[PDB]
Design a binder for these strands. Structure first.
Lengths: 115, 51, 49
RNA sequence: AUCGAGAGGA
């Protein structure tokens, strides 16, 4: 009766932006990234990759409400860096790792199939 | 005193016959007995039936 | 293991098959709201139920 | 619709 459609968790509603960027005014060099129609998968991988960056001072994410489909990622960097650069570099690093993993899994599957 | 209809509403039920409030039936009984008594005065009658 | 992060949960969890029943009391048969609907005849107050 | 009854819920 009040049930939301199942597709609402991954389909952007008309006029909805995938990602929004805001400045965190409490401290310098801090940004809040709001991502719509994403959940713990992307948030967790991005947060961990950001934590791998030595120029990142703070990296965290949360789902404000499980019944909504938004994640907020907060990134603080050193003044010589930018949270936007850190976010972009983290995504690039994750993509590179996934591509390498896919290639090596293909090789391993072929090896196992031949013998 | 006879309360108005809003105090004893008569409701048009599913059957077209109207439904009367309990107060209406009691008032009908009162009117019947009062009329019979008044009849027994305008023409004399035994004190037993009047009582 | 935690589903969101995949980390192990520090405490171990009691888990196993248990017979459960679904009771006839469902929220969609109870949810109710009103904004100026029908009223009673004798008194002009909102109806019941 | 009214009245009554019954079974239930917290």
């Amino acid at each position: 009766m009040n049930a939301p459609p199942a597709f609402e968790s991954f389909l952007l509603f008309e006029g909805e932006k995938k990602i929004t960027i805001n400045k965190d005014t409490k401290v310098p060099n801090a940004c809040l990234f709001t991502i719509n129609k994403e959940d713990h998968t992307l948030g967790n991988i991005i947060k961990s990759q950001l934590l791998k960056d030595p120029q990142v001072l703070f990296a965290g994410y949360k789902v404000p409400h499980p019944l909504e489909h938004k994640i907020i990622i907060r990134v603080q960097t050193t003044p010589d860096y930018s949270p936007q650069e850190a976010f972009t570099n983290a995504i690039t690093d994750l993509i590179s790792e996934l591509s390498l993993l896919e290639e090596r899994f293909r090789v391993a599957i072929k090896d196992k199939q031949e013998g | 005193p006879v309360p108005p209809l809003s105090v004893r509403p008569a409701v048009v039920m599913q059957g077209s016959a109207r439904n009367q409030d309990d107060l209406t039936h009691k008032l009908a009984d009162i009117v019947k007995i009062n009329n019979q008594l008044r009849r027994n005065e305008q023409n004399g009658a035994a004190a037993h039936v009047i009582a | 293991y935690n589903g969101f992060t995949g980390r192990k949960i520090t405490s171990q969890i009691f888990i196993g098959p248990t017979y459960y029943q679904r009771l006839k009391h469902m929220v969609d048969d109870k949810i109710h709201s009103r904004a100026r609907g029908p009223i009673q005849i004798l008194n002009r107050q909102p109806m019941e139920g």
